[PDB]
Each structure stands twice: as C-alpha cells, then as structure tokens.
Amino acid sequence: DLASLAIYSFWIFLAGLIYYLQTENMREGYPLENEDGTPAANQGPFPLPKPKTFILPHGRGTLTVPGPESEDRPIALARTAVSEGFPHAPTGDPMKDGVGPASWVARRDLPELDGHGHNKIKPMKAAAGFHVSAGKNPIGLPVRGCDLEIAGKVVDIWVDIPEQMARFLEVELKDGSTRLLPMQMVKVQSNRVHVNALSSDLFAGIPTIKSPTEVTLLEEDKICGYVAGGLMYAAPKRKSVVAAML
Amino acid sequence: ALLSFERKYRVPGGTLVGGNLFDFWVGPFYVGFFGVATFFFAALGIILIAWSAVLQGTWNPQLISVYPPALEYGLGGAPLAKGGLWQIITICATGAFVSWALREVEICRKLGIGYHIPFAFAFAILAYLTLVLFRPVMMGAWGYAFPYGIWTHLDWVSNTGYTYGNFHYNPAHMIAISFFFTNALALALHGALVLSAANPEKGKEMRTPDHEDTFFRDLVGYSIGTLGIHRLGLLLSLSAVFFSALCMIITGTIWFDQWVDWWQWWVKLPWWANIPGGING
Amino acid sequence: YQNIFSQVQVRGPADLGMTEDVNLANRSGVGPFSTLLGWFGNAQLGPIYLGSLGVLSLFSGLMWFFTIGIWFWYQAGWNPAVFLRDLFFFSLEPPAPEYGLSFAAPLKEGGLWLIASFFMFVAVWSWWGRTYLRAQALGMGKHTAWAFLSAIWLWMVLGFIRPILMGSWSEAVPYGIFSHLDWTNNFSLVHGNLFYNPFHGLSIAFLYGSALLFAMHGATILAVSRFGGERELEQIADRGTAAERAALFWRWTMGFNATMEGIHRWAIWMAVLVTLTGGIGILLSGTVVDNWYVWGQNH
Ligand code: BCL
Ligand code: BCL
Ligand code: BCL
Ligand SMILES: CC[C@H]1c2cc3[nH]c4c(c3C)C(=O)[C@H](C(=O)OC)c4c3nc(cc4[nH]c(cc(n2)[C@@H]1C)c(C(C)=O)c4C)[C@@H](C)[C@@H]3CCC(=O)OC/C=C(\C)CCC[C@H](C)CCC[C@H](C)CCCC(C)C
Ligand SMILES: CCCCCCCCCCCC[N+](C)(C)[O-]
Ligand SMILES: CCCCCCCCCCCC[N+](C)(C)[O-]
Ligand SMILES: CCCCCCCCCCCC[N+](C)(C)[O-]
Ligand SMILES: [Cl-]
Ligand SMILES: [Fe+2]
C-alpha cells in the first residue's frame, strides 16, 4: 500500500527532522552545567552538533558555535540550599551587580553596524533628516519614575536609522548628565514620560555610555538589563495605581 | 542541570502565591504555586479520564472517549458515567490551563520580561472555553460541547459542521481561515528571511537586517521590519483564534439554518435584488 | 506599554537599500510613506525591483485575473450591478470529464479555464524564480525559494499533478470564491471524509502548530524587545540577555528551549510542513485511495 508506506516514511523523516532541529538549537548554552559550574552528568540524549562558523562583517571576526561559554564575569549570587534546584540569592546589590532580572551579557563593546558599516543607532540630533513623524513628540517632556517623582527630562530620541524607529529616549538628570531609556520601557503621555520600572532615585544608577554619539551592544545590554531589573528590585518604591491616578 | 549562562537568572522572587514556598526548580522546569496547581489538575483530570476508560471498557488511546451530558441534562449536573465525569475533567482542564498560564506569568516576573506569552495563550484557553463552556451554556446544554477522544472529537466537528450544511459559508469561519493561512505564510517567510541572512551563500559574510529589508522590498515593494514581523505573527495567530471562537459562539445561538443562506442578505439588497440575469437573477 | 503599536513614529531619508550584486537599474523609485503602517511596522513603501522575470510574472498574473474577470462579466451579462451582487457566485469551471486532458474544450466550456490556468502557472513559477534571484543578487541563502516551493507543491497537486494523474482537467479546482469552497467540501465527501486521511490530520497539526509557534515566537520577541530582542541577526552573532531570557522562559516552562537562530528553523519547517503533508494527502486521494474511511479500516 503506497499510502501506508508514505505515512510510515513520514514519521521516520519527522523524527529525524526533530532530532536535527533540537541539536541545531544547542549551538548555545551547552554543555549543561551543575549549579556549581561543573559539567552536568546528564547532558540529555541529543548530542552537540558539529561546529559552524559565522563570518562577521567589517572586521568583526567570526563566531563558531558550539564553542566554549563566553560568559566569565563574576556572578554576585550565593547558593541557598544544599540540594540542587533552588534559588541563588544576590550577595550584594542585584541591580548594580547585573544578576537576576537585572542581568546583562558581555556583548561586543562596539555599536551594532548597519549594512553599510555605519552605526545602526544614533541620537536623532545627529541623524540627518530624521524627525518625529507621528504621535506625541517626547522630546522636552519631564520623566517620572514609579515613585511618582521627576527623574529628569527628555532631551533627544535615539533612532534606529535602518529601521527608522525610536529605540531609546535620552534623559537628562538633575546633575546635567544623561541616560538612555529603552523605548519599550517608557510610556509617552501628553504631559510626561512615565517609567514604571524605575523610581526617580534609580536613574543615576543606569549604566552610562562612553561616547555621547553612540551606544555599544555591551552598553545596551547593561542599560536594558538594569531597567528591566527595576520591575522586581524597585517594587518597594513603586507607588500604587490609585496613587498614580491622583 | 543549567544552560551555561542560566545561573545568574535562577534568582528568588517573582511568585504570585506562597512567597518562596514553591520558588524552586526540578531539573529544567520551574515550579511555583501554579506549577503544583497544574500538576494537581493535570493528574486528577488524567485520572478521571483513565477511570472513564474503565467504565467504557477500554484502554486503547484511539478508542477512549469522554462525552458530555446528553441534551436531556441541560445545564445541570449528571451521573458520572453519563456526562458527569466529563464535567469534572473539564473543570480540571480549565484549572490546569489557567494555572499553566499563571505559572508563565511568575516565570515572566522572575526573568523581567513582558507578559505577551501567557496573554497569547489565554486566547487558546478562551477558544477552548468557548466550545466547552460559553457556547454550551448559551445554547442551554452541556451536550453541545465536544467529547474528549482523539477521533470522537473529529466526529463532533464533522457532525456539528454539517448541521449547518457546508460550514465553509460561516463568514467568521472564512476570516478565521484567512488568518490561519496568512499566519502560516508569514511564519514561513519570517523563518526563511532570518535564516537566509544568517546563512548566506557559502563563504559569504553574514547578512544584515538591511539585506532582509532590501530582499523583501525588492520582492514585493515593502518590508514590515524586524519589530513588525513579530507583531504581525502574534496578531495573525490571535486573530485566527479570535475569529474561530467568534464563528462558533454565534452558531446555534443567533444563527440556526444553513450558513450558505446567510449570504442571501447581500444578494437581496434592494437595488440589485430583482435585476434579471447572472446566477441569482 | 506592550510594544504592539509604536508610541512615537520617527522618519528620515528614504532607504534605497543594499546594493550587493543587484542591477540597480531595475529598481524603482521609493514610494510614499504610510504613517498608518508606521504604527505597526515600517512606514516606507518601495522601492521595488522589476526585472524581466517580475514583469513577466506581473503580466501573466494580470492576464489570469483578467481571464477570470471577463468570464465573470460575461456571466453577469455585462451588468455592473449583477456583477457585484453575484461576484462570489460566479465560477470559471474546468473542462467536463469527457474532454480528458485535452485543450480541445470550447472556450465557454473549459477553454477559458485552461487559458487562466496557463497564465497562473507562468505567473506563479516566474515569481518563484524571482524569489530565488532576488536572494542570489544579495548573496543570501535560498530559504525563501525553498519554503515557497512547499506552498507551490500543494497548488501544483491541486490543479495540475493530481488532475493529470487522473486523466482529467475536470478534477481541478474552479476559479470562484464560493465555488472553490464547494469543490473543497465535495472533494472530502467523494473521498470518504478527509478527517480519515492521515496526511490531512498532519497538515492540520502543522497549521494549528504554526499559529501556536508564531504566537509563541512573536510574543517571546516582544517580551524581550526591552533588550533589543527583534534584532535577531545580531543576537545570533553575539548572544545577548534578550536571547538568554527568551530561552530560559521556555526552558523553565516546558523543559527545553531554542536559540535565536534555531527558533527560525523550527518556524520555517512548522509552516512548510503544512503544505508539504497537505499536498501528499491530496495527491494520494483518488489515485491510490478512493475512500479514506475504508483505508483507515485497513491500517
Ligand atoms: C465538516 C466540518 C466543517 C467545519 C466545521 C468546524 C467546526 C464545527 C469547528 C470548526 C473550527 C475551525 N475550523 Mg472548520 N470546518 C470545515 C472546514 C475547514 C477548513 C477547510 C480547509 O476546509 C479549515 C481550514 C477550517 C478551519 C477552522 C479553524 C478556523 C477552526 C479550528 C481551530 C481553532 O478553533 O482553534 C482553537 C484552538 C483550541 C480550541 C485549542 C485549545 C488548546 C488548549 C487551551 C490547551 C491544550 C493543551 C493539551 C491538553 C496539552 C497536552 C499535553 C502535551 C504535553 C502537549 N475549517 C468543514 C466544512 N470548523 C472550530 C472552531 O472555530 O473552534 C472555536 C470548530 O469548533
Ligand atoms: C480546534 C477545533 C476542534 C478540533 C479539531 C481538530 C481537527 C479537525 C484535527 C485535530 C487534530 C488534533 N487535535 Mg483537535 N480539535 C479541538 C480541540 C482539541 C483540544 C483541546 C484541549 O481543545 C486538543 C488537546 C486537541 C488535540 C488534537 C491533537 C490530538 C491532534 C493534533 C493537534 C495539534 O497538533 O495541534 C497543534 C499543536 C501542536 C503541534 C502541539 C502539540 C499538541 C499535542 C500533539 C496534543 C496532544 C493531545 C492529547 C492526545 C490530548 C489529551 C492530553 C492528555 C493525554 C490528557 N484538539 C477542537 C474541538 N483537531 C488533528 C488530528 O490528527 O486529529 C486526530 C486534526 O485532524
Ligand atoms: C468539508 C471540507 C473538508 C476539508 C477538505 C480539504 C481539502 C479538499 C483540502 C484540505 C486541505 C487542508 N485542510 Mg481541510 N477539510 C475539512 C476540514 C478541515 C478542518 C476542520 C474541520 O477544522 C481544518 C482545520 C482543516 C485544515 C486544512 C489545512 C491543514 C489544509 C490546507 C493547508 C493550506 O494552508 O492551504 C492553503 C495553501 C495553498 C492552497 C497554497 C497556495 C499556494 C499558491 C502558490 C498561491 C498562489 C497565489 C495566487 C498567485 C493568487 C493571489 C496572489 C496575490 C498577490 C495575493 N480542514 C473538511 C473535512 N481540506 C488541503 C490539504 O492540504 O489537504 C490535505 C486540501 O486540498
Ligand atoms: C491562541 C493562539 C494559538 C496558541 C497559542 C499558545 N499555545 C500555548 C502558548 C501559546 C501562546 C503557550 O505558551 C503554551 C505552551 O507552553 O506552549 C509550548 C501553549 C500550549 N498550547 C498547547 C496545545 C495546543 N495549542 C493549540 C492552539 C493554539 N495555541 C492557537 C492556535 C492547539 C490546537 C489543537 O490547535 C493545541 C493542542 C499545549 C502544548 C501548551 C499548553 C500546555 C498546558 O496547558 O499544560 C497544562 C496541562 C497539562 C500538562 C495536561 C492537562 C490534561 C487535561 C486535564 C486533559 C483534558 C482533556 C482535554 C480537554 C481534551 C483532550 C482530547 C483531545 C483529543 C480533544
Ligand atoms: C517540494 C517542496 C519541498 C520544500 C522543502 C523546503 C523546506 C525549507 C527548508 C529550509 C532549509 C533550507 N536549506 C537547505 C538551505 O537549509
Ligand atoms: C477573482 C476570483 C479569484 C478566485 C479565487 C479562488 C481561487 C481558487 C484557486 C484554485 C486554483 C485552481 N486550480 C488550478 C488548482 O484548479
Ligand atoms: C515539528 C512539529 C511537531 C508537530 C507534531 C504534531 C503531531 C500530532 C499528530 C496528530 C495527527 C496524526 N494522525 C493523522 C496520524 O493522527
Ligand atoms: Cl542553512
Ligand atoms: Fe524571529
């Protein structure tokens, strides 16, 4: 029976495809480790795939995966139980140490480049011809934290030039310096920009950028990691919805 | 065991219930209060199914089937082996689904990410509840729901559909199908585009998002963009399920005849209704 | 803020695109910007590339559409009002069984349908070559052309391969909104209920699964866009906290996860399999299996 052979064959193929897909999705994060950092005994049934090499543009080298885990920075966390499967609590300030929902990855300390080799992101102020085309222009608006206090003001929008989109709001703090706030973590209102993830007192702590005209992937990660981490770690300073309503 | 970059994330906090009581993992899986709630519901429900298999006199997966109370029972309860054992399993399924979603929310909290996933999942749950709860209740009986059986639920789909002739004529059903089709089309396109840029011709440098844009712009004269594509994928999926539930919730409640006849409203429009000729003239 | 719609739109000089090996002479000029589209995705329209293949495809495509249209107008008695009220009821039917696979059928009895199919055939295939070439000119992989083939496969089976294997153009699908729906229902009826066709069941699993996976993926990327998640290519070349958090969400949820690049392999196959299995199931219908219920009883 042709139909029977066809369906029988399909399942063989499907099992083989799933096998392929799974191993293919082990190009990162493997081999698995024990909570102490040592190679875990059980690595699962699917074996690591053979190495593949990505050739990166504009003198950025190559990337080979699977490969030795890149992450080597110190992790400010301590074991909580003798048995495996339990939380590791922060030894210091999670926000400052970059752990938990405030984690960041040691990405390349260079800006992401577009197809021409130019910086993908740039403050609109320096993006020739760019302007706000629709919606409320956030530039000039005060920035309120979840403690309902003003944390600063918007002095510019950092745009993704190739994708023509707002990616960060540049916020000037009390001391005259500025920080970058991820666009997807702010709420532009008619009279202000509200940041639920952070209380006014936490803005100074947002990681800073070396140059005022560019932001690196390493910086973006530290910034985005830090801001998101506020949802959990700044909860004590986050005022109720009814309070915000007033 | 943890992924080689997981440790820094396995932090305490994020739960919605029980503080740190269930705040732990088991292998790769995270638990939490809703992790155990899910296990409870899933186990009980699976157990109530195995028992219904017993009363049915079978252990074969292809045969096992749990039916809702017959139309006679209306919206009241019913004898276990006669609809009641289905009503409980339904409660368990709902409980296990909602708990699975709430567990996802705790996971989102711990990781500091958005809640888009559990929100998306709620649509699936809502489609289920539409068939098993909202429609039955609106129609006046649990008998209108579908049975829990691999092939039996297909019989239900077929029988329910033909009760209105060719179900293809349900207008909401058509829209839903468009979304399902368009979604699969975009999923293929998205998967292919990313991969084609990440895996250029042998020996070439990895392409950029700009190449992705140029490719599609060159192809159809537009590129929705990396943000838009994911926004689109979510919108198509949810819209597909939304219209699915909509096409059903209205069937047998506000529409009772052959769906094909519904389209007569357009044909009978005053200005051209009586013009001779064509198909309907 | 869920990042489903943009809060503020930003606009700069139109993007003319990467050059690579493409013939810039065949690229049109940039179209207008849509603020409306800008809320959801990019506002820029065009430019588009129109080489010979694209012009051929566009032409056939229009001819196909035109052929169906003229038949519909004929069926409407050239009366605009009738055309509009019966638009969904008109149908360009293929030749009767008596004609087999010949092109001898009179225009009003299948010939127009054959002409329409010729144009659609050329349109679709020239477009496929176009998906391949536009990728080649940019030095990219051919994943799009391959994925497209899967969709083309179901289409080929329905209007060409299956009809031919059964020696009759009358086996093909008519060109009509409602009529092609009747054909679909009829096809199942005539083959003993497609719910019994194992390949139809799989096709459904992947169709449902594609909505499942894209809801999952789309929602995941959005959930980590606060860490630049949608910039997937760079996340693949240099993994960031976005990729890690997305992976861990799923690993902690269902026990396993993907990678930023790998998830797109799961995606392309999930979708592609819909029409791949679908095509096989339809190809086997009527040629090898007359009644799926009956077939099911013997398996
Ligand atoms: C002869 C039959 C009729 C017909 C009758 C019906 C009927 C009757 C119904 C549909 C419905 C649907 N039809 Mg129809 N339909 C016909 C022909 C078609 C054709 C076609 C090409 O011809 C198409 C494409 C469709 C398409 C569709 C979809 C739009 C929709 C089903 C999806 C859905 O609701 O998802 C919703 C998703 C869910 C309900 C999934 C929920 C999952 C839950 C929450 C979690 C489960 C977890 C699991 C237990 C875990 C186990 C553990 C493991 C580890 C995983 N129909 C023919 C003409 N159709 C259905 C609908 O609209 O439903 C609302 C419906 O009831
Ligand atoms: C949506 C409209 C109709 C419907 C119409 C159809 C039609 C029509 C078909 C199916 C098919 C399937 N349906 Mg159904 N089905 C309905 C509601 C459900 C529900 C539910 C809880 O709401 C479930 C769990 C299922 C489950 C199933 C699967 C067994 C099978 C493939 C689905 C798939 O891959 O999805 C995509 C999801 C994934 C790829 C993820 C994996 C999901 C796994 C495979 C689900 C296993 C379910 C398990 C056996 C159910 C019990 C769980 C525990 C053991 C108790 N259906 C509603 C009533 N279903 C196909 C089939 O082959 O039928 C035999 C098919 O032809
Ligand atoms: C009463 C009717 C029967 C039935 C009869 C059929 C038949 C007959 C067929 C299907 C098929 C399918 N059915 Mg069924 N089906 C039934 C009930 C169901 C139910 C249900 C009850 O819930 C569901 C969920 C489904 C679901 C499905 C899908 C999985 C599958 C279609 C895949 C697809 O993407 O095609 C859409 C994709 C295409 C048609 C490809 C289009 C590609 C071409 C190249 C596009 C050209 C576009 C063109 C140039 C014009 C526009 C261009 C413009 C630029 C826009 N069926 C009932 C039992 N079903 C198909 C299948 O694969 O079966 C196994 C099929 O042939
Ligand atoms: C709403 C848009 C789409 C979507 C989205 C979606 N599904 C999701 C998510 C999202 C976003 C998840 O995050 C979640 C997930 O974790 O996925 C991996 C999930 C999920 N979608 C799933 C299935 C699924 N989704 C489907 C559909 C859809 N999912 C839509 C198309 C379908 C079908 C048939 O189309 C199915 C089968 C699960 C794999 C997973 C959720 C896992 C879960 O809920 O686990 C808890 C429960 C158990 C482990 C077992 C409980 C057992 C019951 C008590 C049995 C009761 C019987 C049952 C009612 C009938 C069974 C018989 C059938 C043959 C009818
Ligand atoms: C006849 C249809 C067969 C189509 C199968 C195409 C599946 C898409 C696979 C993507 C993988 C592409 N590839 C080979 C370059 O790796
Ligand atoms: C303007 C009306 C367009 C009609 C839409 C219906 C398309 C169904 C196409 C099925 C293709 C026909 N064929 C070749 C496979 O037999
Ligand atoms: C890569 C996606 C994995 C999806 C696999 C889903 C399998 C469910 C299969 C049920 C349909 C099979 N069938 C027709 C023979 O019963
Ligand atoms: Cl590849
Ligand atoms: Fe993606």
Q: Which amino acid is at C226?
A: R
CA of B151 to the centre of ligand 2 (A): 10
CA distance A211 to A121: 13
With a Cβ cut-off of 6 Å, ligand 6 is lined by C 68, 117, 158-159, 172-173, 175-177, 180
Residue A18 CA: nearest ligand 7 atom is 1
Q: Is C27 in the pocket of ligand 5 (CB under 6 A)?
A: no
Report the alpha-carbon angle B156-B161-B165, nearest 5: 145
Q: Resolution for this model in angstroms, one decimal place?
A: 2.5
CB atoms within 10 A of CB C104: 10
CA distance A146 to A148: 5
Which residues in chain C have Cβ-Cβ distances shorter than 8 Å to B221? 28, 31, 45-48
Handedness of CA C242, C245, C248, C253 (dihedral sign): negative
CATH topology of domain B1-163: Photosynthetic Reaction Center, subunit M; domain 1 (1.20.85)
Q: Whose CA is nearest to atom 14 of ligand 5?
A: C143
Burial B158-197 (b: 16+ CB within 10 A, else e): eebbeebebbbbbebbbbbbebbbbbbbbbbbbbbbbbbb
- Write the residue in A29, A114, A232 that is nearest to B5 by C-beta: A29
Report strand pairing: A187-188 vs A193-195.
Answer: antiparallel
Please compute, for residue C155, the number of CA atoms within 13 A of its CA located in the half-sphere on the CB side: 12
Q: How far is CA B279 from CA C72, C76, C88, C124, C175, in A?
A: 10, 8, 10, 30, 15
Helix residue ranges per DSSP H, B57-115: 84-111
CA distance A159 to C13: 13
Contact B48, B92 (CB under 8 A): yes
Structure tokens, C131: 């998906």
CA distance C143 to B97: 36
Q: Is A77 within 8 Å of chain B by CB?
A: yes
Locate the chain A residue with the closest alpha carbon to B227.
Answer: A163
Main-chain phi, psi angles of A177, to 5 degrees: -85, 170
Instruction: Count interface pairs B-C at CB distance under 8 A.
Output: 335
Structure tokens, B210: 């700009």
Q: Which of B64, B123, B132, B157 is the pocket-test mutation for ligand 1 (most atoms within 8 Å of CB)?
A: B157
Q: Return the closest-CA partner of residue C27 out of C46, C43, C44.
A: C46
B211 is in an annotated binding site: no
Q: How far is CA A150 from CA A141, A175, B253, C1, in A?
A: 10, 13, 54, 19
- Write the residue in C240, C262, C263 that is nearest to A221 by C-beta: C240
Report the alpha-carbon angle C15-C16-C22, nearest 5: 145
Q: Which amino acid is at C47?
A: P
To which CATH superfamily is domain B164-263 assigned?
Photosystem II protein D1-like (1.20.85.10)
Name beta bridge partners: A62. Answer: A55
- Write the residue in C86, C248, C268 that is nearest to B195 by C-beta: C268
Structure tokens, B112: 């500091």
Which domains, from first to last, does chain A contain?
Answer: 2-106 (4.10.540.10), 107-239 (3.90.50.10)
Structure tokens, B85: 């054992």
Q: Which residues contact B125 (CB under 8 A, 6 or more apart)?
A: B94, B97, B98, B101
Is C168 strand, coil or helix? coil
Experimental approach taken: X-ray
Which domains, from first to last, does chain C contain?
Answer: 1-141 (1.20.85.10), 142-299 (1.20.85.10)
CATH 1.20.85.10 in chain B is located at 1-163, 164-263
